[PDB]
Design an enzyme around this catalytic site. Structure first.
Site, PDB file in Angstrom:
ATOM      1  N   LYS A  21       6.769  -4.222  -5.703  1.00 12.42           N
ATOM      2  CA  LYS A  21       5.436  -4.229  -5.094  1.00 12.42           C
ATOM      3  C   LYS A  21       5.550  -4.272  -3.569  1.00 12.42           C
ATOM      4  CE  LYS A  21       3.159  -6.378  -9.108  1.00 12.42           C
ATOM      5  NZ  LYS A  21       4.259  -6.878  -9.970  1.00 12.42           N
ATOM      6  N   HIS A  53       1.129  -8.754  -5.413  1.00 12.22           N
ATOM      7  CA  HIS A  53       0.903  -8.387  -4.013  1.00 12.22           C
ATOM      8  C   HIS A  53       0.377  -9.563  -3.187  1.00 12.22           C
ATOM      9  CE1 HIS A  53       0.324  -4.770  -6.634  1.00 12.22           C
ATOM     10  NE2 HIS A  53       1.070  -4.203  -5.671  1.00 12.22           N
ATOM     11  N   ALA A  54      -0.416 -10.438  -3.815  1.00 13.18           N
ATOM     12  CA  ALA A  54      -0.974 -11.629  -3.189  1.00 13.18           C
ATOM     13  C   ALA A  54       0.114 -12.575  -2.674  1.00 13.18           C
ATOM     14  CB  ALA A  54      -1.881 -12.351  -4.189  1.00 13.18           C
ATOM     15  N   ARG A  78       3.411   0.093  -4.653  1.00 15.96           N
ATOM     16  CA  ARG A  78       4.813  -0.150  -4.964  1.00 15.96           C
ATOM     17  C   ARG A  78       5.649   0.851  -4.188  1.00 15.96           C
ATOM     18  NH1 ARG A  78       2.948   0.055 -11.229  1.00 15.96           N
ATOM     19  NH2 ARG A  78       2.579   2.113 -10.354  1.00 15.96           N
ATOM     20  N   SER A  94      -2.828  -1.808  -5.373  1.00 13.37           N
ATOM     21  CA  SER A  94      -2.928  -3.236  -5.650  1.00 13.37           C
ATOM     22  C   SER A  94      -4.248  -3.492  -6.363  1.00 13.37           C
ATOM     23  CB  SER A  94      -2.902  -4.050  -4.354  1.00 13.37           C
ATOM     24  OG  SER A  94      -1.713  -3.809  -3.646  1.00 13.37           O
ATOM     25  N   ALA A  96      -5.439  -6.344  -6.461  1.00 14.81           N
ATOM     26  CA  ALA A  96      -5.980  -7.386  -5.601  1.00 14.81           C
ATOM     27  C   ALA A  96      -6.932  -6.854  -4.519  1.00 14.81           C
ATOM     28  CB  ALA A  96      -4.821  -8.152  -4.956  1.00 14.81           C
TER      29      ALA A  96
END
Length: 125
Positions: A21, A53-54, A78, A94, A96
């Site tokens: 990621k 990702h966070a 990624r 992502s 997120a």
């Protein structure tokens, strides 16, 4: 304490040996939390220890506050260090935030690193 500047922050910093990621983060200067500077740039971050990702974003926002900066994720995806065929490639998004503007990321990797080529796609997750 000392002031920092966006030139000190590496423009791309990735740990790569397979698929992992990554996130594209806008970073804003705020040196010593009060110097008369408020410029910004984008940076590419991507490390395989991150579950999501966070976790990259949380680390990076923490580090930038130690420097004298603040962050905003623009998106992520990624990267794959080929280990099989031709060159570094970038894909996905992502959940997120959204897809990174991967074209920025690939040009940044291409400028920073001596690897002959970098490309991206948005073919799937």
């Amino acid at each position: 304490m000392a002031v920092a500047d966006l030139a000190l922050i590496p423009d791309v910093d990735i740990d790569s040996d397979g698929v992992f990621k990554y996130v594209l983060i806008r970073v804003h200067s705020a040196p010593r939390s009060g110097a008369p500077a408020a410029e910004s740039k984008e940076i590419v971050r991507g490390y395989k220890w991150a579950e999501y990702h966070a976790d990259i974003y949380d680390k990076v926002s923490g580090d930038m506050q130690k420097q004298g900066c603040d962050c905003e994720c623009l998106g992520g995806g990624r990267i794959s260090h080929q280990s099989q065929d031709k060159k570094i490639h970038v894909y996905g998004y992502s959940m997120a935030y959204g897809p990174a503007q991967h074209a920025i990321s690939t040009e940044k990797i291409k400028a920073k690193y001596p690897d002959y080529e970098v490309t991206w796609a948005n073919d799937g997750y």
